[PDB]
């Protein structure tokens, strides 16, 4: 099923929420993505930091409009409070439109993430700068820097309107919008946030958040509705979706594509990919086997170091989804992810490209071949062959025909077929003999 494999999405994810990436850096990543046979760039722009500003950032919520220039000041400041990156603060609308167009012309899509209700430090800060009160979730006196309180109607309304503003921009120029949903209050609860949101149902009268997880389902579904209204497919990370396999709080919108990144860990019991598929969700395999955190560049340098990610790529194929329960889990594609958890780390293009190249090579039948050198070779053939001998001319014409007769849907596994055809053309041109 070569055609089914090549039809899958192959995606590189870049955390440009925590850390600034310039348009030039992002274009270079797009170029490499295209070369290695990827289909999409997944660009987080809201992920702790918020690093994408529309021309009009005015937000209507809470019975008022927050002025564009105030929302911009609030977000720039709020992002800087998370991390004031010396390289830059945000991409502009003009830059994003140009980047999406640049990618489109190369056959690469762009999938944005603007994360909530977790990983939203900068939006929380921005809301406080606008004057919204107490937006942050707290757990027995420990305030999350990252997560909104779903009981705070003003904070929730603002956040939804902000997501809507971005989704309206991305409408018609993208296909999928990642609303995130990972790791609720991971700081304040020591990575127990879903358990906390579920706890009051089963452990009442203990001070746990009343209707916490029910409100989360409603929030996720309302963001899904917002995204869908703009003709975009919503996507979200898996960990909070039917956490603890618990279907008793409500149901998630089936139109949410699941980015399946984790199988969970000790005391963090996530729904299996089997359960999620059976509930009607499509799955993008985002296995954290393949993760790379910038600056963790070799064995021993911490979790998700480059050597660990390269090992994960070698040992966990694109078809291996987290927590399958032994079931056959279909996928829409696979996504290798680079993250900026320590955003002051130096971004190394060569290390990212090595990760990308290894993912492509390890799953070569899924990745598109590279035809650009073949097209260049054709452009370099002498146009007029009259002055050469008939025998030598025929050989060039046959070699050109052979290139133009290559299957246009070859995989990276078949690159040598293309490269051999290029070499043969070059040989025949070199052998052109003047009459
Ligand atoms: C969806 C996702 O990956 N969320 C976070 C994320 N979550 O990963 C974990 O929490 N992983 C983990 C948890 C417990 C034990 C081992 C790994 O990993 C990335 C790399 O650190 C972070 O940049 C992301 O923000």
From Swiss-Prot:
<feature type="region of interest" description="Catalytic domain 1">
    <location>
        <begin position="3"/>
        <end position="435"/>
    </location>
</feature>
<protein>
    <recommendedName>
        <fullName>Beta-N-acetylhexosaminidase</fullName>
    </recommendedName>
</protein>
<comment type="similarity">
    <text>Belongs to the glycosyl hydrolase 20 family.</text>
</comment>
